[PDB]
Structure 1
Amino acid sequence: MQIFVKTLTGKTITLEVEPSDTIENVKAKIQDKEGIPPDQQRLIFAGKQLEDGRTLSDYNIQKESTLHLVLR
């Protein structure tokens, strides 16, 4: 399924993911497109920072959900 990741610079990234993918899996997919290391990425959804070890499903992230990305 597709989700969106929006930056404060105005970019909208798309990722193909599964509900069981982990946050680090997501950050690696961002790295693959943007070159930003996962440890420089803060992902936000529903007013919460997303944590390593958890899945998208843990946060109720569903099809065409939008995450926000800020860089360290």
Structure 2
Amino acid sequence: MQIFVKTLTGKTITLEVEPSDTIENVKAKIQDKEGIPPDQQRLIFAGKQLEDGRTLSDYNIQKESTLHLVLRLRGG
């Protein structure tokens, strides 16, 4: 299915994903399209920051949903 990722600069990225994909998987897809390392990515949906080890289905992220990408380096 298709989902979208919107950036702080207002641009829309289109991804192809499955409901069983993890948030970590989604960040890898963003790296593919945008060159941004997963450790620099935070994803927001329905007002919440998404956790790497959960799936899209866990968050009820269905087709044509829009996530928001914030660039912020993960802790060490």
| Same fold per superposition (TM over 0.5) | yes
Q: Secondary structure of the equivalent of 1:30? A: helix
C-alpha distance after superposition, 1:13-55 (max 9, x if no partner): 0100000000010000000010000010000000110001100
Provide the aligned length of Structure 1 versus Structure 2.
70
In the alignment, structure 2 segments of 5+ residues that lack a partner are 71-76
Question: Partner residue of 2:74?
Answer: none
Structure 1's consecutive aligned runs of 4 or more residues displaced over 4 angstroms after TM superposition are none
- Unaligned runs of 5+ residues in structure 1 are none
2:29 is paired with a residue whose SS is helix
The 5-angstrom pairing of residues 55-70 of structure 1 reads 55-70=55-70
Q: TM-score, normalised by structure 1?
A: 0.95
Q: Give TM-score scaled by structure 2 length.
A: 0.90
Secondary structure of the 2:27 match is helix
